[PDB]
Amino acid sequence: EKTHRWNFVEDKKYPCNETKTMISSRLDKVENISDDFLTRDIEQKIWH
RNA sequence: GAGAAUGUCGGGGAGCCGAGGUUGUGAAUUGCUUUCAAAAAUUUUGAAAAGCAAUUCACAAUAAGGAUUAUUCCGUUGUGAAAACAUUCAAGGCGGGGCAACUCGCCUU
């Protein structure tokens, strides 16, 4: 904080792909799976 | 000035449902008025009917009307003479979703 600023509103948050990240959280909580089942195809499907 | 992304404040349109109210029918109870209709001393009481009601319940309709049997609707909007429109609108295929009806995406004219 003490030396740099990022040219955007200092106290504002900006969207960072909520969809995939929240899918990742819900796919993490289920467990009992390999940590590779989340790919482009699976993510787009479950989104649909 | 234009364009895209992110938030804030408003507006418009469409849709799925709910509870009353009102008018009318039927009923339970109780009234005001009038006539029949008897008794009694112009007046008081009793039977019946009608008019108007009140409290509660069930039901019918809720813009007059016109479709249709899809678990679908059109009727208070705008334009304007055509009483004609607008407010829904193609073909396919490649998929996701369900008991399936049906719903949701992608691809080329």
For chain A, give me the number of helices (H) and strands (E)?
A: 2, 0
* C-alpha distance from residue A14 to each of A6, A28, A31 (Å): 12, 24, 30
| SS3 labels along chain A | CCCCCCCCCCCCCCCCCHHHHHHHHHHHHHCCCCCCCCCHHHHHHHHC
Nucleotides of B under 7 A from a protein CB: 5-7, 95-96, 104-105
CB A23 within 8 A of CB A46: yes
- Is the four-CA dihedral A18, A21, A27, A38 of positive or negative sign? positive
* Contact, A14 CB vs strand B, < 7 Å: yes
CA A48 to C1' B74, whole Å? 37
CA A30 to C1' B89, whole Å? 46
Contacts 24+ apart (CB under 8 A), A20-23: A23/A47
Q: Phi/psi of residue A24, each to 5°?
A: -65, -40
Structural determination approach: cryo-EM
